[model samples]
Target: MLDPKLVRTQPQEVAARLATRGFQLDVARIEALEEQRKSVQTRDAIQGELDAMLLGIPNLPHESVPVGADEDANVEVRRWGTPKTFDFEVKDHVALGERHGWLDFETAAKLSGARFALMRGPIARLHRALAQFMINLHTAEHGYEEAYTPYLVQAPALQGTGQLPKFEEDLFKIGRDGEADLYLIPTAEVSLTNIVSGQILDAKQLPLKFVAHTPCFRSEAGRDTRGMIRQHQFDKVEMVQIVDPATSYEALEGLTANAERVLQLLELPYRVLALCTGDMGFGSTKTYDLEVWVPSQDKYREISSCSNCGDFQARRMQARYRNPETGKPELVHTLNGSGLAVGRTLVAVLENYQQADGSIRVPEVLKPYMAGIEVIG
Candidate 1:
């Protein structure tokens, strides 16, 4: 959320910047609300309306973000490793998993309908190993504290992370008689970042780095309707940081590198793309997507996205940290990333490490996690 004072003082400039990201703020409406803020009934009514509109406004894009209309215009920063050449014909993960009897979409369909997956045998272990590998990697090597968060979250928690109100259609909501509505977290990003919601922290705790492995649930409305590529539920190793506002950009870079490190260790070929203004997430001022190579697809697919929300979320949740110089509380910047999406990482590993006989060779880093097995058939 942007500072209301900023919007009040520079409505035109704010609206102009929002236009870059394809949002049109109602400058006249906002100015009118400000004028009526002193009256009792009008103040309460328009102020609530103004806050709702503010929630709808996305974070302004950072200067570094490319000024483009959509993802096609996202700028590629760099590539790592190389896509492996197949000795034999490459098969998509579905075909490979079915041939090996390790993935069962039919069973999943019977139990929970489409956009669900059921894996067994070596593939199941591999999926679990991928998540374990990511959480361990982020926590141990990246200075992130591991957290276990609830899958069900309250609406305010989702609202705190900029997931409610606007993207509610993309979420799974649950409610029953005599109970408040709860939401299934679309990403652990919502849970992890909201840990500090409505709190003020010491300056010494300037940066809070946390990681969690959670099964993210999404309605995925109008997205890929088949396969693990777009599951209604998927495992993700999510990383989040709460940092001093001044260091948020620096934190964003380091957080992105932390995510990239997982791909590097797995020996996966991937590229980093600086997301354009129009392609950025709802609450992110800037974002970078890590697209991993998929041999079967013969192209890069987004496996992770790291973003710096730059106090946008903090304002909504009233999360703050004390500043030594000012002796006052100020909003803390928030950042989140998929250290790696476990199912997608599994897809990458299977495609990148498949053998001519259809066995999947375990990446060296995951061998121990795979219970000393070097290959999965």
Candidate 2:
């Protein structure tokens, strides 16, 4: 989408933008090779190389992003409620969940192998309730539109969201060699963000907000992910905003606040961390992660991540809005955040609200969603 018309229909314009990824391109040879490759398998091979170069180019980090190599470089932005003092022997979410057969890893492993879980009973109810509560709050109070999207998406949709080709093995592909290959979404962010792909919007509608609750599936090698921390199949409430680039940073603030609101309602102690360049996602220029206090671990775990892509994804998706002054379509900034990951939130609730007696007190806000049940054993 960034000068694609040039490189695609007319190579010159394409070179202008694509070449700036700080690489060289031979458009004539590209087109010539492209034409020759069109005959079949070997033909599209050149196409993949060009696209591979484009796909491998991650978004440049924002000036404000911390210049660090890893998580150690992340800067803490703020702290919320303090982690409660515990006097009794603390049990992990797995141990507590197993008390009532609520979280069953053995069954999950039997059904789907490692990296999966079969949650049942009260915790199951709690997980579903969390997703409902977050989605309701975002759509009702956060000025986002509630949306329903297909969990299965085509390659272009994944590409538009920067999860394809490069991370192909990380996704769950369903089709064979020559069929219409489709993939299970790794997160609702993929489906929600791609909603505007290839769409040209009006300037007044510059900020398009969306929220969705869906079960996400990923097949990555999550070697050390135990319990619900990194399940192959998990539930999430995701938020996405396609906004005017001029105000995208402000939108990022709002998006982060919206996610924080979830923790506030759940009465969870948490902290916000400004992610360093090395820790940011491929499509994000800037990011903030909301980490919830896990009692058993005596530490915080990421439950949500908010990021402003600054037109990086919009350019790839061809998602744009007409600029009132210029009267031309321009890339819109894209932002996405986990309003909260439902399983991790459940783990947080179970651990943080664990009673000395081993039962868990339901967060006040979730009581209604739980049909007035106040405790889970």
Candidate 3:
């Protein structure tokens, strides 16, 4: 959600930025709306200035964000670990899973169509292990509070997180039984970020860090239907932070590092790419996507995206923290990231750790989680 003032004051600039993201914001229509808003607002002063209030409704983008148009323009921050080279021909996860009798995508597809999957045996264990590892690392080592949230949310809940009103086609909607139109959560960020919606927090609770392991569902609106790069359903460990404006950037760095810690421990080769404004998310002011090397794909594919949303969401959700010094409530900075998407990490593990004998090596960090089973054959 962009600052409404940008639309009223610099509608052209806001429209131009949206154009780069393939969003068509009609300046003329918005202008007309503003004009009418002005008339109504001026006539009703006690009703609060609707135009400015509508325009002032959103928070400003952070100073550090790069100005641009999409993902191709993202900048690579750094690479960690190294991708392995297999001695023999390595198969993709689907084939590998079939051989191991651990995945049943055929059944999943029959039940839910194209992008769904079912895991069993070692694959299921591995998926659970990765999720557990990430959540445990965040809660115990990174000072994030562990939380469990619902998998389905109302449309307004997603709108508060900037996933609706524009990106509805990308979500799975559940409308039935007289319930509010529901959406299968695309990410836990949608749920966690909205926890403070329409709420105020004290300065003492300036920074709130929350972590959750959840099942995420997406419609995969415009993505290739192959493997786990994009899927209808997958497991993920997500970390979200609501922090004071002064420490948001530092918190972003720490949060990114906390995410990177998993790859470092697993010894998976990966790179962190800084997303340009044009390539950033709808709500993200700045973003860093962690791409893990895939031997089969012959390239690094995004497995984690950590974003500093600034006050973009705080404005829409009315989530704020009191400033002790000013003694006034102000929007808090929000940051979210996949501690690492479990499905993609599983794909990386399957590809990079596969042996000539068709066994998958359990990462050193996950050995304990796997109950001392160093390798899955």
Candidate 4:
């Protein structure tokens, strides 16, 4: 949600900005509606009507965000490295994963359902090593406090992150007998952001850097769903930053770089994309997607999405920070990004490091976590 003051004072300007994102804000309709409300509505009644509109309204795109219609309009900032040369036929993650029965989707279907996977032997170890490597990188080198949060969160927690009321279908909910419903987290950002939600911190605590590794659950169907390219459940290392509005851009700059480092260290070829306003997520005022080269697709796929949500999410969570000079609590900007998706990183590794005989050459940084096995077949 954007500041209500802006909506009230700058309707045309806000409407213009939102139009770039393909949102229709009929000023005439709002004008007539407000006229009727002013005539008869009072107190809570007026507030609720305004609240309803704000909930559906997406955060205004930042001035720096590219104003384009879709992903095709996304600007490529820069690219790092190049696709790994393959002597033999390049295999997708599935064939490489299927080699030696290290990856099995058939068993995953029997145990649970499709869009899920079962990893065994060295492949499973590689997945675990990838996660351990990711979380450690963010904490030890990237400057973040590691947090272990619950997988199930309450409604307010979801609402605090702008995932409720509008995007309920994307979530997995659990109903208890006569109790409040809880939803499985779509990402670690939910609980991580909620850690500072509904609270005011001192100015010195202005920036809260939090990193979490977890299994995200999303019920989104359709689209890509072969092997691990898309899944109902996947592992990821998420980074969250709560900071003062003034320094938020640089914070996000640092945040996105932190994520890019994951690919850099792994010696993977990837590019940074400045997501167009229309292609940006609902809560993201600005976003950058890190796409890694996958030999299987013969193209790049997104492995991380770094977004600066600004004060929009905080407006709902009431997350504030006290100013030492003025002694006032103001909204804190919120940012979230994938240090890199564990499953996708595994996919990137599976294809990028595959040998002619179907063995995988582990990245030097990940070798420490692979025990004594430098190569896995």
What is candidate 2's local distance difference test score? Answer: 0.85
Q: In lDDT terms, how accurate is model 1?
A: 0.90
lDDT of each: 0.90, 0.85, 0.81, 0.90
lDDT of 1 by residue, 178-272 (tens): 88888899899989999999899998987899999999998988555556988999999999999999998999999999999999999999999
Model 4 segments beyond 4 Å from truth? Answer: 41-43
TM-score of each: 0.97, 0.87, 0.90, 0.97
TM-score attained by model 1: 0.97
lDDT of 2 at 224: 41
> Candidate 3 lDDT, tens digit per residue, 1-377?
56555677887777665565556666665666667777877885523444333432223345565555566666777998767776788688777777856877787888988888888877888888898888888888999999999999998788778886667899989888976788899999999999998888988886899998998998777754666668888899999999998898898899899989998887889999987666777787667889999888788988999988888888878899888898888888889999989999999888888888888889877777787678888
Q: For residues 77-186, write the lDDT of model 4, one tens digit per residue.
A: 99999887788998888988886888999899999988899999889999999999999999999889999999999899988999987899999999888899989999
Regions of model 2 farther than 4 Å from truth:
1-49, 176-178, 222-224
Q: Per-residue error at 166 for model 1, in Å?
A: 1.4
Return the candidate ranking by lDDT, descending.
4, 1, 2, 3
What TM-score quantifies how close candidate 3 is to the native fold? 0.90
The model with the greater lDDT, 1 or 2, is 1
